[PDB]
Coordinates of C-alpha atoms in Angstrom, one line a residue:
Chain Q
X5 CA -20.9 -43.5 151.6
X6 CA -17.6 -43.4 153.7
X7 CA -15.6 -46.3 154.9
X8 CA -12.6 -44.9 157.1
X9 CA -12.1 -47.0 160.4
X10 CA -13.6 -44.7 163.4
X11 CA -14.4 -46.8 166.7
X12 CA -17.2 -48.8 165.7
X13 CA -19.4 -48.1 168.6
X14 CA -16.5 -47.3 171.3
X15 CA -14.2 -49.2 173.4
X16 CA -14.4 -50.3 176.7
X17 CA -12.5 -49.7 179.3
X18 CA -8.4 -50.7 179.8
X19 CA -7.1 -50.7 182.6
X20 CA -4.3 -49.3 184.1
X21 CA -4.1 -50.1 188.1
X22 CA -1.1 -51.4 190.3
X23 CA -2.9 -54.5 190.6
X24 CA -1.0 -56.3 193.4
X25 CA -2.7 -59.0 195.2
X26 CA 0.2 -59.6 198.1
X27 CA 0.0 -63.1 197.8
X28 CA 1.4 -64.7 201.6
X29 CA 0.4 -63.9 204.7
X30 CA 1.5 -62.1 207.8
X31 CA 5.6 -62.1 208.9
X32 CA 4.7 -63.5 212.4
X33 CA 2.6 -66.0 211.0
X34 CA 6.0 -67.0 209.1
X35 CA 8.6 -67.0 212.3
X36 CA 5.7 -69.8 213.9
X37 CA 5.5 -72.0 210.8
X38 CA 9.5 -71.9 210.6
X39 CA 10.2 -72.4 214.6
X40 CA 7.5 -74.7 214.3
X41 CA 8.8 -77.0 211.8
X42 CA 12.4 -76.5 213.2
X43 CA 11.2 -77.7 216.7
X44 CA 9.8 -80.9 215.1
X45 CA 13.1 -81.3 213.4
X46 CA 14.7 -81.3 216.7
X47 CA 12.7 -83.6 218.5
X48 CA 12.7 -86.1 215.7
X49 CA 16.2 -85.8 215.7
X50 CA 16.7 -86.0 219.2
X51 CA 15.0 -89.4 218.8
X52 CA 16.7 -91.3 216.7
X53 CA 20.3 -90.0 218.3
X54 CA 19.6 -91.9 221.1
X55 CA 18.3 -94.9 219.5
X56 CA 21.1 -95.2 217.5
X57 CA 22.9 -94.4 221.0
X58 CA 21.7 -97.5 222.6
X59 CA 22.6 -99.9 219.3
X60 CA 26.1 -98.2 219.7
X61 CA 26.6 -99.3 223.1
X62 CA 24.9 -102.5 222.0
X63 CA 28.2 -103.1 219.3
X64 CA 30.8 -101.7 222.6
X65 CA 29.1 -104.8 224.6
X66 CA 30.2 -106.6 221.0
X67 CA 33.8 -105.7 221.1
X68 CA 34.1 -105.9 224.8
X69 CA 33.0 -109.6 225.1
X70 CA 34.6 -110.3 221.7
X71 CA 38.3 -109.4 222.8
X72 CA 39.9 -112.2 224.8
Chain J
X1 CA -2.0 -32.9 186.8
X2 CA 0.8 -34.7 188.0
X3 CA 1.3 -38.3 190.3
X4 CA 4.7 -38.5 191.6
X5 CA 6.2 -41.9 193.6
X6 CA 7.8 -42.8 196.5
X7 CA 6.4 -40.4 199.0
X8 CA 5.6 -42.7 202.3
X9 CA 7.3 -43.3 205.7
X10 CA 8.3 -46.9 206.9
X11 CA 6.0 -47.4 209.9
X12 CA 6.4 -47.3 213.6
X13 CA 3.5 -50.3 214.0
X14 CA 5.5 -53.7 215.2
X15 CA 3.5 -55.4 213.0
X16 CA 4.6 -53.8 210.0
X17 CA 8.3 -53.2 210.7
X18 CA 8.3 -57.0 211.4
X19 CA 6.9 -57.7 208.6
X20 CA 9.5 -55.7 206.3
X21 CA 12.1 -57.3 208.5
X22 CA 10.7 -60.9 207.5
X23 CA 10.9 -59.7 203.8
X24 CA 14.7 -58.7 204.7
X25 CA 15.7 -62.2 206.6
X26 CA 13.1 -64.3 205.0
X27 CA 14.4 -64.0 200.9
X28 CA 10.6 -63.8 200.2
X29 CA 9.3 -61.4 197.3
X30 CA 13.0 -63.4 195.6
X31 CA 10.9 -66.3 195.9
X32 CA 7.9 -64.6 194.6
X33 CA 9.8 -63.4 191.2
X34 CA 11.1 -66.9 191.3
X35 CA 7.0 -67.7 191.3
X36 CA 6.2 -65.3 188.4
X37 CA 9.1 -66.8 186.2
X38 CA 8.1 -70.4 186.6
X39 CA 4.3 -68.9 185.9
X40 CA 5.7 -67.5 182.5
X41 CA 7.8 -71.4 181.8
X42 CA 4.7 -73.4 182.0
X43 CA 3.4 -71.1 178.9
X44 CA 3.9 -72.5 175.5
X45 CA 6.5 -70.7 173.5
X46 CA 5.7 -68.2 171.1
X47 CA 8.2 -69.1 168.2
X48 CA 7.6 -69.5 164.8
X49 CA 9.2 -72.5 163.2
X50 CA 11.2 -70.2 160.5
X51 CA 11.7 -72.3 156.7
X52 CA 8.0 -74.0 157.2
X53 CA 6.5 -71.2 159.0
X54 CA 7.6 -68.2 157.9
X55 CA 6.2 -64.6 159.7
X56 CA 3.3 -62.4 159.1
X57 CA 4.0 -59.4 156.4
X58 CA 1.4 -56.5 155.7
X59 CA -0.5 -56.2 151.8

């Protein structure tokens, strides 16, 4: 009998492929999602500027008929 | 029998050249290695706690 270590039947395969799966998706699909959400920003923003713009006047009616 | 790299031509399409020009502005395949090494922190560390475990030897 022999007992040296050939491959027992062979081996499958290995493999050996620039597996890349390019996870994300297309540029211009990026530049709408990011003027997108920028846009929102701005309008949300643009919001509550002038609320706060009308309590600011609110505090100039405060000093104004606080003075005399 | 030979296989050699980096024989291509950057492409005239829009589509493509805006693409690589997203990658340029855009920081994106940085943000994809960031990706792969936060995929390799959630692992559990391979190390080998040394004067209670110590390593594997050969007969």
């Amino acid at each position: 009998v022999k007992q040296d270590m050939p491959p027992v039947g062979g081996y499958g395969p290995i493999d050996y492929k620039r597996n890349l799966p390019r996870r994300g998706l297309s540029g211009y699909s990026m530049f709408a999602v990011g003027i997108g959400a920028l846009l929102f920003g701005y309008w949300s923003m643009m919001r509550w500027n002038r609320e706060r713009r009308r309590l600011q006047i609110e505090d100039f009616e405060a000093r104004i008929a606080l003075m005399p | 029998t030979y296989k050699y790299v980096n024989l291509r031509e950057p492409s005239m399409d829009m589509k493509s050249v805006t693409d690589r020009a997203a990658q340029t502005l855009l920081w994106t395949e940085l943000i994809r290695g960031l990706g792969m090494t936060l995929s390799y922190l959630f692992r559990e560390p391979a190390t080998i706690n040394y004067p209670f475990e110590k390593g594997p030897l050969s007969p």
